[PDB]
Amino acid sequence: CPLMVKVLDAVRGSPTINVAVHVFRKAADDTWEPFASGKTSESGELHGLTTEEEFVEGIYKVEIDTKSYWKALGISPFHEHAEVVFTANDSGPRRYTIAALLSPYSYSTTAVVTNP
Amino acid sequence: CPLMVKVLDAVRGSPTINVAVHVFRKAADDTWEPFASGKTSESGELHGLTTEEEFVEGIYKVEIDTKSYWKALGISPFHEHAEVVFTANDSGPRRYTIAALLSPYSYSTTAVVTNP
Amino acid sequence: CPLMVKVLDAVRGSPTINVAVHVFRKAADDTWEPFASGKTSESGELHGLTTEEEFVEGIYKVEIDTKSYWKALGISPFHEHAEVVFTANDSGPRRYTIAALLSPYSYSTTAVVTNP
Amino acid sequence: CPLMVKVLDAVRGSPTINVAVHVFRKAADDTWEPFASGKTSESGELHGLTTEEEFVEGIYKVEIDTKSYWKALGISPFHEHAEVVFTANDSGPRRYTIAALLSPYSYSTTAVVTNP
Ligand SMILES: Cc1ccc(C(=O)c2cc(O)c(O)c([N+](=O)[O-])c2)cc1
Ligand SMILES: Cc1ccc(C(=O)c2cc(O)c(O)c([N+](=O)[O-])c2)cc1
Alpha-carbon gap, residue D84 to D108, rounded angstroms: 10
Domain of D14: which CATH number? Answer: 2.60.40.180
Ligand 2: nearest atom to the Cα of D4: 11
Find the CB nearest B10 among D13, D110, D114: D110
Among A8, A67, A78, pick the best mutation site for testing chain B contact (most B Cβ within 10 A). A78
Q: Which residues of C9-43 are buried (b: 16+ CB within 10 A; e: fewer)?
A: bbbbbbbbeebbbbbbbbeeeeebeebbebebeee
Alpha-carbon gap, residue A22 to C68, rounded angstroms: 39
Conformational region of residue B88, where left means phi above 0, alpha means psi within -120 to 50, and beta covers everything else: beta
Q: Which residues of D39-50 are buried (b: 16+ CB within 10 A; e: fewer)?
A: ebeeebbbeebb
DSSP calls for A48-87? -S--TTT--SEEEEEEE-HHHHHHHTT---SBS-EEEEEE
Angstrom resolution of this structure: 1.6
Give strand ranges (E) for D10-105.
14-15, 20-26, 32-39, 45-46, 58-64, 82-88, 95-103
End-to-end CA distance of chain C: 10
Residues 6+ apart with CB under 8 A from C12: B104, B105, C73
Q: Which backbone phi and psi does B66 adopt, to 5 degrees?
A: -70, -30
Instruction: Give the number of other CB atoms < 10 A from CB of residue B73.
Output: 13
Instruction: Give the number of other CB atoms < 10 A from CB of residue C73.
Output: 13
CA distances from residue D83 to A32, B80, C63 in whole angstroms, order as listed: 43, 33, 11
- The residues lining ligand 1, judged by C-beta closer than 6 Å to any ligand atom, are A 6, 8, 97, 99-101, 108-110, 112; B 106; C 6, 8, 97, 99, 101, 108, 110, 112
End-to-end CA distance of chain B: 10
Considering its fold, how many domains does chain C have in total?
1
DSSP one-letter code for C7: E
CB contact under 8 A, C105 and B78: no
DSSP one-letter code for D104: T
CB contact under 8 A, C78 and D59: no
| Solved using | X-ray
3-state secondary structure of C16: coil
Instruction: Give the number of other CB atoms < 10 A from CB of residue B78.
Output: 26
Alpha-carbon gap, residue B90 to A91, rounded angstroms: 44
Alpha-carbon gap, residue A108 to B108, rounded angstroms: 4
Domain that holds residue B63: 3-114
- How, if at all, do strands A95-103 and A3-9 pair? parallel
- Cα angle vertex A20, ends A19, A25, to 5°? 140
Residue A62 contacts residue A18 (beta carbons within 8 Å): no
